Amino acid sequence: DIIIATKNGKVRGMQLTVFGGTVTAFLGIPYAQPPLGRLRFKKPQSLTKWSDIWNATKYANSCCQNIDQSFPGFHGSEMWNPNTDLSEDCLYLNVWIPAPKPKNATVLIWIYGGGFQTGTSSLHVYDGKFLARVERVIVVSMNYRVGALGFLALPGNPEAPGNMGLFDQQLALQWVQKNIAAFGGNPKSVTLFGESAGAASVSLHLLSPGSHSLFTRAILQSGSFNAPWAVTSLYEARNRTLNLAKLTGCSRENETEIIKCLRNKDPQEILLNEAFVVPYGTPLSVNFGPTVDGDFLTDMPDILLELGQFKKTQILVGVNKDEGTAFLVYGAPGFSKDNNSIITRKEFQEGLKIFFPGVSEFGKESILFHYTDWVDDQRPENYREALGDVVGDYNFICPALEFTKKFSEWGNNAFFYYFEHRSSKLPWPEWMGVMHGYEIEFVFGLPLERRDQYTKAEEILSRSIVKRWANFAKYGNPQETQNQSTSWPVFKSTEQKYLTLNTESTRIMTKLRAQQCRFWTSFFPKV
Ligand SMILES: *[C@@H]1O[C@H](CO[C@@H]2O[C@@H](C)[C@@H](O)[C@@H](O)[C@@H]2O)[C@@H](O[C@@H]2O[C@H](CO)[C@@H](O)[C@H](O)[C@H]2NC(C)=O)[C@H](O)[C@H]1NC(C)=O
Ligand SMILES: *[C@@H]1O[C@H](CO[C@@H]2O[C@@H](C)[C@@H](O)[C@@H](O)[C@@H]2O)[C@@H](O[C@@H]2O[C@H](CO)[C@@H](O)[C@H](O)[C@H]2NC(C)=O)[C@H](O)[C@H]1NC(C)=O
Ligand SMILES: *[C@@H]1O[C@H](CO[C@@H]2O[C@@H](C)[C@@H](O)[C@@H](O)[C@@H]2O)[C@@H](O[C@@H]2O[C@H](CO)[C@@H](O)[C@H](O)[C@H]2NC(C)=O)[C@H](O)[C@H]1NC(C)=O
Ligand SMILES: CN(C[C@H]1CCN(Cc2ccccc2)C1)S(=O)(=O)c1ccc2ccccc2c1
Ligand SMILES: *[C@@H]1O[C@H](CO[C@@H]2O[C@@H](C)[C@@H](O)[C@@H](O)[C@@H]2O)[C@@H](O)[C@H](O)[C@H]1NC(C)=O
Ligand SMILES: CC(=O)N[C@H]1[C@H]([C@H](O)[C@H](O)CO)O[C@@](O)(C(=O)O)C[C@@H]1O
Ligand SMILES: *[C@@H]1O[C@H](CO)[C@@H](O)[C@H](O)[C@H]1NC(C)=O
Ligand SMILES: *[C@@H]1O[C@H](CO)[C@@H](O)[C@H](O)[C@H]1NC(C)=O
Ligand SMILES: [Cl-]
Numbered sequence: 001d002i003i004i005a006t007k008n009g010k011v012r013g014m015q016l017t018v019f020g021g022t023v024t025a026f027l028g029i030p031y032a033q034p035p036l037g038r039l040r041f042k043k044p045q046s047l048t049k050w051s052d053i054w055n056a057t058k059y060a061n062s063c064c065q066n067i068d069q070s071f072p073g074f075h076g077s078e079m080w081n082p083n084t085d086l087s088e089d090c091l092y093l094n095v096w097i098p099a100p101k102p103k104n105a106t107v108l109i110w111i112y113g114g115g116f117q118t119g120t121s122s123l124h125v126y127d128g129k130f131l132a133r134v135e136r137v138i139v140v141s142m143n144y145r146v147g148a149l150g151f152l153a154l155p156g157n158p159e160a161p162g163n164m165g166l167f168d169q170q171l172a173l174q175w176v177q178k179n180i181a182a183f184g185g186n187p188k189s190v191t192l193f194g195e196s197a198g199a200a201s202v203s204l205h206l207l208s209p210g211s212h213s214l215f216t217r218a219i220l221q222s223g224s225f226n227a228p229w230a231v232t233s234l235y236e237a238r239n240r241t242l243n244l245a246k247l248t249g250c251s252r253e254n255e256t257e258i259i260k261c262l263r264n265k266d267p268q269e270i271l272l273n274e275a276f277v278v279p280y281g282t283p284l285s286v287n288f289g290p291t292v293d294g295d296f297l298t299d300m301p302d303i304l305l306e307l308g309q310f311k312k313t314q315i316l317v318g319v320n321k322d323e324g325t326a327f328l329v330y331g332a333p334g335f336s337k338d339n340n341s342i343i344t345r346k347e348f349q350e351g352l353k354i355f356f357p358g359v360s361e362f363g364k365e366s367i368l369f370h371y372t373d374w375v376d377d378q379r380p381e382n383y384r385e386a387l388g389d390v391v392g393d394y395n396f397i398c399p400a401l402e403f404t405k406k407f408s409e410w411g412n413n414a415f416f417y418y419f420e421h422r423s424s425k426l427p428w429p430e431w432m433g434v435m436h437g438y439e440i441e442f443v444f445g446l447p448l449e450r451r452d453q454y455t456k457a458e459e460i461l462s463r464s465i466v467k468r469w470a471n472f473a474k475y476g477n478p479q480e481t482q483n484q485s486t487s488w489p490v491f492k493s494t495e496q497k498y499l500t501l502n503t504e505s506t507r508i509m510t511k512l513r514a515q516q517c518r519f520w521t522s523f524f525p526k527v
């Protein structure tokens with residue numbers, strides 16, 4: 001029986017057996033008033049103390065969200081879908097502490113991804129008990145609001161000011177600040193990490209002034225705020241908040257009477273209508289997301305980045321080899337997970353229209369021209385592989401690289417990885433490669449469980465990554481020093497060195513996707 005006194009009351013945890021040892025899990029600790037009723041769309045309000053012993057012995061409700069129902073019964077898709085009841089009452093967090101209770105442990109805070117539209121901390125691949133067990137860190141994860149319910153914006157209007165899901169996250173970091181010492185954690189040694197929209201979130205916390213002092217270091221996996229999907233324009237955010245009001249019959253002249261009306265809709269009505277607030281959706285549409293609210297974000301993040309207006313600290317940043325392939329089977333014609341997806345030139349061109357719907361003919365012609373100068377025009381996988389790189393290079397790799405140059409240019413140490421191992425248990429087809437999101441189980445140390453059908457070389461790779469991530473959190477330096485591991489050099493804007501992560505050989509390489517990212521980061525923004 002392990003009871004910890006938090007500032008808001010006592011919480012009871014449970015005991016786990018991990019690898020012939022013990023982790024104490026506290027699952028589902030509330031960190032805010034439930035954002036219900038008049039509280040829907042407003043910033044999260046602080047929690048009133050309780051007198052009982054709160055029982056933190058199972059994962060809490062996931063936040064309301066639309067579900068990937070594209071591949072029913074397929075583990076490759078459904079593993080990302082919520083594994084707890086959806087509810088608007090979802091502002092809860094989890095804590096894994098090592099046993100015995102540590103003395104002053106480094107804290108890892110996980111922020112999940114999902115396009116700011118989907119996700120939950122209770123997913124199996126976000127289980128923090130292995131990290132607690134193996135590296136003696138405390139792992140914290142939190143649920144934050146998503147979709148319109150977390151990112152609707154009438155900017156300047158406190159009834160729907162925007163960025164609430166980011167303020168959810170921030171209130172969770174604040175909770176760790178006031179309470180993790182009671183769990184044996186060091187509030188002065190808190191490393192944020194997250195993937196995709198989680199990584200975009202971590203990166204905005206580097207920019208937000210109200211987060212500066214709620215963490216120490218940052219890890220960005222497959223995501224950053226400067227990615228083209230990450231920050232909604234304050235124009236579009238208003239156009240989208242208005243389109244939802246018309247779709248639900250809530251159109252009013254007094255913008256506040258609009259919020260009141262949207263607050264008497266059932267969550268299902270708000271959810272079914274989110275996809276239509278944009279005129280041309282894509283598999284990557286962030287219908288409702290981060291915006292420049294004047295509160296969490298004070299200026300356009302590109303400006304802040306360029307002019308050195310962020311928290312000065314170390315960053316670990318990285319991307320996977322085939323970031324784009326996942327999205328191709330969600331709309332791109334000629335694509336399927338259930339065949340090799342050889343597409344034609346004309347099918348490739350049609351794919352650009354799906355992914356670049358508001359881009360000019362010349363801009364689409366320009367993606368085609370820089371990605372279809374073939375070595376061997378006769379290879380039939382040419383066009384299929386070109387469309388995946390187009391989506392991955394544009395949406396993930398090039399902004400992640402451009403974020404790391406810009407950030408390091410202001411003096412801080414930066415470390416960049418290129419994860420190029422395809423999980424031996426991966427359920428998607430092989431042409432899909434080293435997919436978006438399939439480094440996460442390695443970061444969380446799931447291949448360390450021998451019962452889990454991973455190969456031994458995978459257990460070695462996960463163990464090494466877990467050491468590197470924990471040494472970055474503890475010491476700012478993501479080395480593995482005992483076994484004769486490749487030393488991981490700092491990413492400088494001059495030489496641009498990065499580390500490959502694979503089961504075979506860990507190499508140091510230079511200037512990733514250099515020809516591709518010159519197109520994306522210089523030419524393409526002008527179109
Ligand atoms: C909170 O938990 C206490 C302690 O019980 C523990 O947690 C439970 C979820 C279960 O797994 C138990 O086996 C654990 O030991 C609960 O205390 C029990 O309360 C009921 C009715 O109130 C009583 O009949 C039992 O004898 C109590 N003790 C045990 C060991 O069951 C308490 O009820 C829980 N409260 C809430 C709000 O969930
Ligand atoms: C800003 O919003 C208008 C209106 O959105 C339309 O109506 C909403 C209620 C919702 O159902 C959306 O899906 C609709 O698109 C947009 O105007 C539309 O633009 C498309 C082409 O871009 C056109 O075919 C529609 O007929 C237009 N509808 C109306 C009522 O004017 C407008 O494009 C949005 N602005 C941006 C920058 O996307
Ligand atoms: C690969 O599959 C796609 C998807 O089509 C569906 O899934 C298949 C696996 C099979 O079960 C079909 O019955 C389904 O239609 C194929 O794309 C379709 O292609 C046909 C003819 O080319 C076209 O009429 C449809 O519009 C396409 N549908 C979509 C959603 O794009 C594709 O042709 C297959 N290619 C190869 C090389 O296997
Ligand atoms: C509807 N979604 C997208 C579908 C395609 C991927 N599918 C989950 C998955 C993940 C990994 C491997 C296989 C399947 C869900 S989404 O999660 O809401 C979303 C929306 C916008 C985004 C913009 C940028 C980056 C990520 C984004 C995610
Ligand atoms: C490091 O490697 C271990 C197994 O290798 C053996 O033990 C190490 C400590 C060296 O003495 C080496 O000569 C041996 O061959 C793993 O058990 C251990 O988990 C690894 N650690 C990390 C962080 O990857
Ligand atoms: C998930 C949710 O929304 N509510 C509650 C669930 C379900 O309502 C019931 O199990 C019926 O499904 O049950 C609890 O009350 C329980 O007694 O364990 C906990 C939780 O708060
Ligand atoms: C924890 O570590 C910090 C330094 O990082 C130190 O100032 C603090 O006093 C320590 N507290 C405990 C309880 O060990
Ligand atoms: C909108 O309605 C609310 C509630 O009735 C009121 O407080 C606010 O002043 C109104 N604003 C305008 C511009 O009418
Ligand atoms: Cl050709």
Ligand SMILES: [Cl-]
Nearest residue numbers: 370518519523
């Ligand atoms: Cl060019």
